[PDB]
Amino acid sequence: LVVAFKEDNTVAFKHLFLKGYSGTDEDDYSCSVYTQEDAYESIFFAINQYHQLKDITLGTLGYGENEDNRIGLKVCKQHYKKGTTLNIDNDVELDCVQLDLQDLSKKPPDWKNSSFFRLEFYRLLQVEISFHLKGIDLQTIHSRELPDCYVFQNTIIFDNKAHSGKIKIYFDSDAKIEECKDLNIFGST
Amino acid sequence: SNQLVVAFKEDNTVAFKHLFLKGYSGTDEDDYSCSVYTQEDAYESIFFAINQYHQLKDITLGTLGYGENEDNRIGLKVCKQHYKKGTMFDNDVELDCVQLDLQDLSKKPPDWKNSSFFRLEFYRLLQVEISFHLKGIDLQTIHSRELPDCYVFQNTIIFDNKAHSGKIKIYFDSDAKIEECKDLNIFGSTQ
Amino acid sequence: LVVAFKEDNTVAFKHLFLKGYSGTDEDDYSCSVYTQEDAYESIFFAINQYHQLKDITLGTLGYGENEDNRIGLKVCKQHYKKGTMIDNDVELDCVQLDLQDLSKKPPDWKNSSFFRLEFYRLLQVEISFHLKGIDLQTIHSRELPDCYVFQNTIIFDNKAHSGKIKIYFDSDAKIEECKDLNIFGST
Amino acid sequence: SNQLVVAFKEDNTVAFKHLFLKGYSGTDEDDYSCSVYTQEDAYESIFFAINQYHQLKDITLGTLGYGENEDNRIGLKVCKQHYKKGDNDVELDCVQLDLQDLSKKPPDWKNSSFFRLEFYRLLQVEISFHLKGIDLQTIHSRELPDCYVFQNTIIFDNKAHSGKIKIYFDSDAKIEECKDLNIFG
C-alpha cells in the first residue's frame, strides 16, 4: 500500500482528467469554473480523456471493472425536482448514465447530444463522473517476484451546491492493493 | 432580523468579477481588481463587460436574473466623465450617460458599439462607469417553496483614469440587499 | 516634487515598450530574452509601439523634441570589431529614425543592414526617445500647468555573452514648462 | 576544478534550460526542471530538444559552437532504457544523430522505429550533446581566452511509473584546450 505510488498516480490523474489543471489544488478542491461553457468543456474533457486513455497515460495502467463487471464510466447528475417563477421543489432527483467504451468509440458520439447532458444549472446540485483504473507498480516487480497491482476508484465531482456562480471540481482517488486480473496494460500488445 | 449571508454575497461577487472583468486573474491587483495600459485593452474590457451582460443567460452558473434598475427599466447604464472641450481646458468635468435596454444589445449588429458615445478621448477622460442590477436566490438556505427572498446585486464597474498616469484602474463594486423576488425570471428556467 | 506621477508613468511605459513585460521586474532589469527571434521581436515591438503611441497611450502624452530639436527615436548598437574568435575596439553604430521614416509604407528601416545584428559579437542595443506628459491633477485645483519630459531608454544588455539578454527600461523625468505642444487626440 | 568562473557556467546552463526544455517556465519544478503527464507532451518535449539542437546556430544569443564527441563527429546521442519484454532485465538502445541527418528535408529520423516508445516498460530517455562556448569577458585584453566545453544531458525519467515523467537538465562545464571550432560566426 505504497503511499507514494498511490499519491504520485493521483497527481497524474488530476493532470489527465481535469481540463486546465494548473498543477496545484485551488483550495480543498482542485479547480473551479465560472461559466456554462467551461463547465461543459470540463465534463466532456474528462470523458474524452477516459476514452483516449490508452494514447495519453505515461503509466502502467489499464481500465478497471465497475460494480456490474463492465468497463466504462458512470455519470450522475443531482438536480432539484421541478413542478407543475421559482419552479423548484427541495426534493432532489438523481439521474445516472453508464457509458461503455463502445458508446464512447461510436462515430459520431451520440452521448454528447443526449438529453442527459443538457444541464439546467439553476437547479443543478452536482455532476459526478466515476471510473475504475487498474495500475502496476513496476518498482516492486523485481523486488517481490510478483507485481503490486492497485485498483483506483476515481471520482470527479462538479459541486454547484453553493449556487454562487462557481462550480468546485474535486478529484478523489481510492487506491487498494489487488491481485492481477490479467487485464490489458495500455501500452502492451 | 438579519437574513443576508455574507458568504453568499461575497461568493457571488467573486463570480461576477470572473464573468465581467476581461482577463481577471482570480485575485485582485490591489484595492482595484485589474488594470489596463492601452486604448485597445481599455475598449476590449469595456465591451467585454457589456457583451457578458447581454449573454448572461448562457454564461452564469447561479440562480440569477436581470434586475430592474434605479428607474424601474431593464438594462445597463454606461457613463463617462471627461474634462469639457476648451483650449487645453470650476465644473471643468462633463458627465455623459447612456442607458442600453435588452433590445438594444440584442440587435445584430449591436448599433451601440458604433455610437459616438463609445469614441473615448482618453487625454480628457476621468472615468467610465458601467452599472446594472442582478437578482439572485440562495437555494441552499430557502427551505421554502413560495416566499423566496432574492439578493438584489447593484453591480458597478469603474474604469478610473483620474490619475492620468497611463494606467486605468478597473474596480468592481457589488451591493447586495435582501428583497422581494417580485416576478423576475431565473435564466435557465422554463414552463 | 510629484514622485508618484514620475513612477506611475514609468510603470505604464514598461507595459507599452517591453514586449511580454509580465508586470513585475525580473531582477535589476525588467525582462530578458534567450533567443535571436525574441531579441528581434522585442526590439521591433518597442519601435512599433513608439510609432503607434498616439493610438496606444491612456495618458496625456506627446512626442518630445530631442536635444537637437528633432522628433524620433535613436537606436545604437555596440559590436566588437573583427577579433580573433589595444585594450578592446568596439564599433558604436547609431541610427536616428524620424516619425516620417516610421510612417513610410512599407517601413524600409526594418529591412536595413543596421538591424542585421551579429549576436556573437553584440555588446548591446539601446533605444532612446523623449516623451512629454502633463499632470492634469495640478490643473484640477489652480491654473499652473505642471509638465514633464521623460528621457526614456531601453537597453538590451548582452555584455555577459551568457545566452541571455537583459532588458532595462530607464526613464528620467524633469519638470519643464510646455510650450503649446501637441498631445495625442488634441484638436 | 580550475579557472572557476561559476557565473559563466551557471548563466549558460539557465539559457540552455530555456533553449532545449519545451515550455520551461523559467524556474525548476523541484529537483528536476519540468514534468510531462501525457505521451504527446513526452514526444513534443523530446523532439523540441532535438530540433533546438539542430537550429542552435539561429537561436543562441551566446558565443556557442557544436562540440565533438569521442567519435570526432558533431551530433547528439539519444538513449532509451526499457524493461526486457520476455543478470539484467533492462534493455539499453542508443542512437547517434548526425547534423546531416537532422538537416535532411523531411527529417526521416522523426518517423523511425527507434522513436516509437513503449511507455508501459520505459525507464528513461536521455538526450546528450556537447557544446563549446567562449567567455568574451576574458579575451578583451588579448591575454588568455577561456574555452568551456558543456557536456549537456537531458533526462526524461519514468523510473517511478506513476504517470509523470520528470525532465532533468544537466550541464558539466570544463575549461578545455581551446580547439577554436566555428562559433556560429
Side-chain angles (χ1 to χ4, degrees), chain C residues 17-42:
Chain C
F17 307 108
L18 303 182
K19 195 186 160 53
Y21 178 67
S22 69
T24 107
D25 287 343
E26 196 173 322
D27 187 27
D28 46 289
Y29 51 90
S30 305
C31 37
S32 57
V33 300
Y34 297 89
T35 65
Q36 295 173 31
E37 172 71 332
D38 295 349
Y40 283 123
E41 283 181 352
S42 292

PDB file of all heavy atoms in Angstrom, chain C residues 17-42:
ATOM      1  N   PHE C  17       6.338  49.537 -23.972  1.00  0.00           N
ATOM      2  CA  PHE C  17       7.500  49.235 -24.832  1.00  0.00           C
ATOM      3  C   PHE C  17       8.190  47.881 -24.576  1.00  0.00           C
ATOM      4  O   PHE C  17       8.959  47.423 -25.433  1.00  0.00           O
ATOM      5  CB  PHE C  17       8.538  50.336 -24.724  1.00  0.00           C
ATOM      6  CG  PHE C  17       7.930  51.689 -24.999  1.00  0.00           C
ATOM      7  CD1 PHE C  17       7.727  52.601 -23.970  1.00  0.00           C
ATOM      8  CD2 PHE C  17       7.510  52.032 -26.272  1.00  0.00           C
ATOM      9  CE1 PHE C  17       7.108  53.833 -24.214  1.00  0.00           C
ATOM     10  CE2 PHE C  17       6.914  53.267 -26.516  1.00  0.00           C
ATOM     11  CZ  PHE C  17       6.712  54.160 -25.485  1.00  0.00           C
ATOM     12  N   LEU C  18       7.941  47.227 -23.465  1.00  0.00           N
ATOM     13  CA  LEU C  18       8.616  45.956 -23.259  1.00  0.00           C
ATOM     14  C   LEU C  18       7.677  44.808 -23.624  1.00  0.00           C
ATOM     15  O   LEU C  18       6.682  44.519 -22.905  1.00  0.00           O
ATOM     16  CB  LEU C  18       9.098  45.853 -21.823  1.00  0.00           C
ATOM     17  CG  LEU C  18      10.020  46.956 -21.335  1.00  0.00           C
ATOM     18  CD1 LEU C  18      10.442  46.674 -19.930  1.00  0.00           C
ATOM     19  CD2 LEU C  18      11.219  47.114 -22.226  1.00  0.00           C
ATOM     20  N   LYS C  19       7.974  44.162 -24.790  1.00  0.00           N
ATOM     21  CA  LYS C  19       7.139  43.050 -25.279  1.00  0.00           C
ATOM     22  C   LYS C  19       7.038  41.979 -24.225  1.00  0.00           C
ATOM     23  O   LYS C  19       8.060  41.566 -23.694  1.00  0.00           O
ATOM     24  CB  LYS C  19       7.706  42.431 -26.575  1.00  0.00           C
ATOM     25  CG  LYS C  19       6.703  41.540 -27.296  1.00  0.00           C
ATOM     26  CD  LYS C  19       7.329  40.830 -28.483  1.00  0.00           C
ATOM     27  CE  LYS C  19       6.558  39.618 -28.915  1.00  0.00           C
ATOM     28  NZ  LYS C  19       5.120  39.912 -29.153  1.00  0.00           N
ATOM     29  N   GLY C  20       5.840  41.545 -23.914  1.00  0.00           N
ATOM     30  CA  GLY C  20       5.664  40.476 -22.940  1.00  0.00           C
ATOM     31  C   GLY C  20       6.015  40.795 -21.494  1.00  0.00           C
ATOM     32  O   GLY C  20       6.046  39.872 -20.671  1.00  0.00           O
ATOM     33  N   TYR C  21       6.231  42.098 -21.144  1.00  0.00           N
ATOM     34  CA  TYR C  21       6.511  42.509 -19.770  1.00  0.00           C
ATOM     35  C   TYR C  21       5.423  42.047 -18.911  1.00  0.00           C
ATOM     36  O   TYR C  21       4.296  42.479 -19.150  1.00  0.00           O
ATOM     37  CB  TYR C  21       6.621  44.028 -19.654  1.00  0.00           C
ATOM     38  CG  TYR C  21       6.871  44.508 -18.248  1.00  0.00           C
ATOM     39  CD1 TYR C  21       8.066  44.229 -17.599  1.00  0.00           C
ATOM     40  CD2 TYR C  21       5.946  45.298 -17.588  1.00  0.00           C
ATOM     41  CE1 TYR C  21       8.308  44.669 -16.295  1.00  0.00           C
ATOM     42  CE2 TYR C  21       6.197  45.784 -16.301  1.00  0.00           C
ATOM     43  CZ  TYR C  21       7.379  45.462 -15.655  1.00  0.00           C
ATOM     44  OH  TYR C  21       7.567  45.887 -14.367  1.00  0.00           O
ATOM     45  N   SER C  22       5.745  41.131 -17.950  1.00  0.00           N
ATOM     46  CA  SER C  22       4.813  40.468 -17.020  1.00  0.00           C
ATOM     47  C   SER C  22       4.100  41.368 -16.044  1.00  0.00           C
ATOM     48  O   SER C  22       3.174  40.934 -15.419  1.00  0.00           O
ATOM     49  CB  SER C  22       5.576  39.472 -16.168  1.00  0.00           C
ATOM     50  OG  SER C  22       6.440  40.171 -15.282  1.00  0.00           O
ATOM     51  N   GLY C  23       4.609  42.537 -15.785  1.00  0.00           N
ATOM     52  CA  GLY C  23       4.009  43.434 -14.814  1.00  0.00           C
ATOM     53  C   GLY C  23       4.922  43.708 -13.648  1.00  0.00           C
ATOM     54  O   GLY C  23       4.786  44.756 -13.025  1.00  0.00           O
ATOM     55  N   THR C  24       5.869  42.807 -13.367  1.00  0.00           N
ATOM     56  CA  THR C  24       6.847  42.992 -12.299  1.00  0.00           C
ATOM     57  C   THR C  24       8.257  42.806 -12.896  1.00  0.00           C
ATOM     58  O   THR C  24       8.435  41.925 -13.744  1.00  0.00           O
ATOM     59  CB  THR C  24       6.575  42.036 -11.115  1.00  0.00           C
ATOM     60  OG1 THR C  24       7.557  41.012 -11.121  1.00  0.00           O
ATOM     61  CG2 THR C  24       5.174  41.399 -11.138  1.00  0.00           C
ATOM     62  N   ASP C  25       9.259  43.608 -12.455  1.00  0.00           N
ATOM     63  CA  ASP C  25      10.637  43.443 -12.950  1.00  0.00           C
ATOM     64  C   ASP C  25      11.195  42.062 -12.608  1.00  0.00           C
ATOM     65  O   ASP C  25      10.859  41.488 -11.578  1.00  0.00           O
ATOM     66  CB  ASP C  25      11.584  44.500 -12.387  1.00  0.00           C
ATOM     67  CG  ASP C  25      11.408  45.880 -12.941  1.00  0.00           C
ATOM     68  OD1 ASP C  25      10.763  46.017 -14.003  1.00  0.00           O
ATOM     69  OD2 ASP C  25      11.940  46.830 -12.329  1.00  0.00           O
ATOM     70  N   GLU C  26      12.060  41.546 -13.490  1.00  0.00           N
ATOM     71  CA  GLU C  26      12.642  40.216 -13.348  1.00  0.00           C
ATOM     72  C   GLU C  26      13.706  40.204 -12.263  1.00  0.00           C
ATOM     73  O   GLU C  26      13.769  39.237 -11.513  1.00  0.00           O
ATOM     74  CB  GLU C  26      13.215  39.726 -14.681  1.00  0.00           C
ATOM     75  CG  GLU C  26      13.486  38.233 -14.685  1.00  0.00           C
ATOM     76  CD  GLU C  26      13.889  37.621 -16.008  1.00  0.00           C
ATOM     77  OE1 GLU C  26      13.338  38.042 -17.052  1.00  0.00           O
ATOM     78  OE2 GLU C  26      14.768  36.725 -16.003  1.00  0.00           O
ATOM     79  N   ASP C  27      14.528  41.262 -12.173  1.00  0.00           N
ATOM     80  CA  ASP C  27      15.561  41.388 -11.135  1.00  0.00           C
ATOM     81  C   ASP C  27      15.919  42.889 -11.082  1.00  0.00           C
ATOM     82  O   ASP C  27      15.012  43.689 -10.845  1.00  0.00           O
ATOM     83  CB  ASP C  27      16.740  40.442 -11.465  1.00  0.00           C
ATOM     84  CG  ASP C  27      17.811  40.320 -10.402  1.00  0.00           C
ATOM     85  OD1 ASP C  27      17.491  40.526  -9.212  1.00  0.00           O
ATOM     86  OD2 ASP C  27      18.977  40.027 -10.763  1.00  0.00           O
ATOM     87  N   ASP C  28      17.160  43.290 -11.373  1.00  0.00           N
ATOM     88  CA  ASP C  28      17.516  44.706 -11.517  1.00  0.00           C
ATOM     89  C   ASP C  28      17.013  45.215 -12.897  1.00  0.00           C
ATOM     90  O   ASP C  28      16.777  46.420 -13.076  1.00  0.00           O
ATOM     91  CB  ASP C  28      19.039  44.927 -11.370  1.00  0.00           C
ATOM     92  CG  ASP C  28      19.930  43.960 -12.154  1.00  0.00           C
ATOM     93  OD1 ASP C  28      20.005  42.758 -11.765  1.00  0.00           O
ATOM     94  OD2 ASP C  28      20.558  44.399 -13.144  1.00  0.00           O
ATOM     95  N   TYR C  29      16.818  44.272 -13.851  1.00  0.00           N
ATOM     96  CA  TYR C  29      16.333  44.546 -15.199  1.00  0.00           C
ATOM     97  C   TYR C  29      14.841  44.150 -15.248  1.00  0.00           C
ATOM     98  O   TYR C  29      14.369  43.387 -14.380  1.00  0.00           O
ATOM     99  CB  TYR C  29      17.174  43.796 -16.245  1.00  0.00           C
ATOM    100  CG  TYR C  29      17.338  42.325 -15.949  1.00  0.00           C
ATOM    101  CD1 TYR C  29      16.426  41.390 -16.432  1.00  0.00           C
ATOM    102  CD2 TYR C  29      18.348  41.874 -15.113  1.00  0.00           C
ATOM    103  CE1 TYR C  29      16.515  40.048 -16.087  1.00  0.00           C
ATOM    104  CE2 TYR C  29      18.457  40.532 -14.774  1.00  0.00           C
ATOM    105  CZ  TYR C  29      17.532  39.626 -15.257  1.00  0.00           C
ATOM    106  OH  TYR C  29      17.608  38.318 -14.892  1.00  0.00           O
ATOM    107  N   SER C  30      14.099  44.692 -16.249  1.00  0.00           N
ATOM    108  CA  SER C  30      12.652  44.467 -16.418  1.00  0.00           C
ATOM    109  C   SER C  30      12.310  43.072 -17.012  1.00  0.00           C
ATOM    110  O   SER C  30      11.391  42.404 -16.506  1.00  0.00           O
ATOM    111  CB  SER C  30      12.070  45.572 -17.284  1.00  0.00           C
ATOM    112  OG  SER C  30      12.396  46.830 -16.712  1.00  0.00           O
ATOM    113  N   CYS C  31      12.999  42.647 -18.095  1.00  0.00           N
ATOM    114  CA  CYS C  31      12.811  41.302 -18.644  1.00  0.00           C
ATOM    115  C   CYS C  31      13.985  40.897 -19.446  1.00  0.00           C
ATOM    116  O   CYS C  31      14.927  41.638 -19.520  1.00  0.00           O
ATOM    117  CB  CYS C  31      11.516  41.135 -19.432  1.00  0.00           C
ATOM    118  SG  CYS C  31      11.048  42.554 -20.396  1.00  0.00           S
ATOM    119  N   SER C  32      13.977  39.663 -19.931  1.00  0.00           N
ATOM    120  CA  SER C  32      15.045  39.087 -20.719  1.00  0.00           C
ATOM    121  C   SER C  32      14.538  38.202 -21.870  1.00  0.00           C
ATOM    122  O   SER C  32      13.367  37.795 -21.894  1.00  0.00           O
ATOM    123  CB  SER C  32      15.927  38.237 -19.815  1.00  0.00           C
ATOM    124  OG  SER C  32      15.152  37.238 -19.174  1.00  0.00           O
ATOM    125  N   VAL C  33      15.450  37.894 -22.807  1.00  0.00           N
ATOM    126  CA  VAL C  33      15.183  37.019 -23.941  1.00  0.00           C
ATOM    127  C   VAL C  33      16.342  36.071 -24.069  1.00  0.00           C
ATOM    128  O   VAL C  33      17.472  36.470 -23.807  1.00  0.00           O
ATOM    129  CB  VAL C  33      14.923  37.785 -25.254  1.00  0.00           C
ATOM    130  CG1 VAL C  33      13.719  38.706 -25.114  1.00  0.00           C
ATOM    131  CG2 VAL C  33      16.141  38.578 -25.706  1.00  0.00           C
ATOM    132  N   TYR C  34      16.072  34.831 -24.489  1.00  0.00           N
ATOM    133  CA  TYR C  34      17.076  33.786 -24.637  1.00  0.00           C
ATOM    134  C   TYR C  34      17.268  33.328 -26.082  1.00  0.00           C
ATOM    135  O   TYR C  34      18.089  32.425 -26.296  1.00  0.00           O
ATOM    136  CB  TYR C  34      16.685  32.601 -23.787  1.00  0.00           C
ATOM    137  CG  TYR C  34      16.649  32.943 -22.320  1.00  0.00           C
ATOM    138  CD1 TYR C  34      15.496  33.430 -21.726  1.00  0.00           C
ATOM    139  CD2 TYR C  34      17.761  32.754 -21.516  1.00  0.00           C
ATOM    140  CE1 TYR C  34      15.440  33.698 -20.364  1.00  0.00           C
ATOM    141  CE2 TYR C  34      17.696  32.948 -20.137  1.00  0.00           C
ATOM    142  CZ  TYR C  34      16.540  33.449 -19.568  1.00  0.00           C
ATOM    143  OH  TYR C  34      16.501  33.788 -18.237  1.00  0.00           O
ATOM    144  N   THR C  35      16.571  33.949 -27.081  1.00  0.00           N
ATOM    145  CA  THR C  35      16.724  33.587 -28.497  1.00  0.00           C
ATOM    146  C   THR C  35      16.807  34.812 -29.399  1.00  0.00           C
ATOM    147  O   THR C  35      16.283  35.866 -29.060  1.00  0.00           O
ATOM    148  CB  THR C  35      15.578  32.711 -28.970  1.00  0.00           C
ATOM    149  OG1 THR C  35      14.375  33.465 -28.919  1.00  0.00           O
ATOM    150  CG2 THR C  35      15.433  31.464 -28.171  1.00  0.00           C
ATOM    151  N   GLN C  36      17.402  34.637 -30.591  1.00  0.00           N
ATOM    152  CA  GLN C  36      17.549  35.709 -31.583  1.00  0.00           C
ATOM    153  C   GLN C  36      16.197  36.229 -32.027  1.00  0.00           C
ATOM    154  O   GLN C  36      16.038  37.442 -32.148  1.00  0.00           O
ATOM    155  CB  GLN C  36      18.325  35.223 -32.795  1.00  0.00           C
ATOM    156  CG  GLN C  36      19.769  34.859 -32.501  1.00  0.00           C
ATOM    157  CD  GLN C  36      20.450  34.211 -33.692  1.00  0.00           C
ATOM    158  OE1 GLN C  36      20.138  34.493 -34.867  1.00  0.00           O
ATOM    159  NE2 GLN C  36      21.384  33.311 -33.422  1.00  0.00           N
ATOM    160  N   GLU C  37      15.205  35.328 -32.239  1.00  0.00           N
ATOM    161  CA  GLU C  37      13.874  35.767 -32.654  1.00  0.00           C
ATOM    162  C   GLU C  37      13.265  36.648 -31.581  1.00  0.00           C
ATOM    163  O   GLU C  37      12.809  37.741 -31.903  1.00  0.00           O
ATOM    164  CB  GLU C  37      12.970  34.570 -32.983  1.00  0.00           C
ATOM    165  CG  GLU C  37      11.495  34.883 -33.256  1.00  0.00           C
ATOM    166  CD  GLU C  37      11.126  35.597 -34.553  1.00  0.00           C
ATOM    167  OE1 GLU C  37      11.963  36.356 -35.097  1.00  0.00           O
ATOM    168  OE2 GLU C  37       9.977  35.402 -35.016  1.00  0.00           O
ATOM    169  N   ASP C  38      13.290  36.208 -30.317  1.00  0.00           N
ATOM    170  CA  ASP C  38      12.732  37.011 -29.241  1.00  0.00           C
ATOM    171  C   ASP C  38      13.447  38.354 -29.137  1.00  0.00           C
ATOM    172  O   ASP C  38      12.796  39.363 -28.858  1.00  0.00           O
ATOM    173  CB  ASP C  38      12.820  36.286 -27.903  1.00  0.00           C
ATOM    174  CG  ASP C  38      11.989  35.014 -27.765  1.00  0.00           C
ATOM    175  OD1 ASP C  38      11.131  34.751 -28.667  1.00  0.00           O
ATOM    176  OD2 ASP C  38      12.203  34.270 -26.758  1.00  0.00           O
ATOM    177  N   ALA C  39      14.770  38.391 -29.381  1.00  0.00           N
ATOM    178  CA  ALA C  39      15.528  39.642 -29.315  1.00  0.00           C
ATOM    179  C   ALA C  39      15.075  40.595 -30.401  1.00  0.00           C
ATOM    180  O   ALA C  39      14.797  41.760 -30.099  1.00  0.00           O
ATOM    181  CB  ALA C  39      17.013  39.376 -29.431  1.00  0.00           C
ATOM    182  N   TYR C  40      14.927  40.104 -31.646  1.00  0.00           N
ATOM    183  CA  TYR C  40      14.431  40.950 -32.730  1.00  0.00           C
ATOM    184  C   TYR C  40      13.002  41.368 -32.472  1.00  0.00           C
ATOM    185  O   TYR C  40      12.704  42.551 -32.583  1.00  0.00           O
ATOM    186  CB  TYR C  40      14.512  40.241 -34.065  1.00  0.00           C
ATOM    187  CG  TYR C  40      15.911  40.214 -34.617  1.00  0.00           C
ATOM    188  CD1 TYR C  40      16.533  39.008 -34.935  1.00  0.00           C
ATOM    189  CD2 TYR C  40      16.583  41.395 -34.923  1.00  0.00           C
ATOM    190  CE1 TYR C  40      17.803  38.978 -35.513  1.00  0.00           C
ATOM    191  CE2 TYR C  40      17.856  41.378 -35.488  1.00  0.00           C
ATOM    192  CZ  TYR C  40      18.465  40.168 -35.786  1.00  0.00           C
ATOM    193  OH  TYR C  40      19.727  40.168 -36.330  1.00  0.00           O
ATOM    194  N   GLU C  41      12.127  40.426 -32.077  1.00  0.00           N
ATOM    195  CA  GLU C  41      10.735  40.744 -31.789  1.00  0.00           C
ATOM    196  C   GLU C  41      10.631  41.844 -30.722  1.00  0.00           C
ATOM    197  O   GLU C  41       9.794  42.736 -30.852  1.00  0.00           O
ATOM    198  CB  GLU C  41       9.964  39.499 -31.324  1.00  0.00           C
ATOM    199  CG  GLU C  41       9.571  38.517 -32.422  1.00  0.00           C
ATOM    200  CD  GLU C  41       8.776  37.308 -31.941  1.00  0.00           C
ATOM    201  OE1 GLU C  41       8.636  37.120 -30.708  1.00  0.00           O
ATOM    202  OE2 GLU C  41       8.284  36.547 -32.805  1.00  0.00           O
ATOM    203  N   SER C  42      11.486  41.801 -29.688  1.00  0.00           N
ATOM    204  CA  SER C  42      11.434  42.792 -28.618  1.00  0.00           C
ATOM    205  C   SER C  42      11.894  44.152 -29.077  1.00  0.00           C
ATOM    206  O   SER C  42      11.307  45.145 -28.631  1.00  0.00           O
ATOM    207  CB  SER C  42      12.266  42.351 -27.423  1.00  0.00           C
ATOM    208  OG  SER C  42      11.649  41.226 -26.819  1.00  0.00           O
TER     209      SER C  42
END
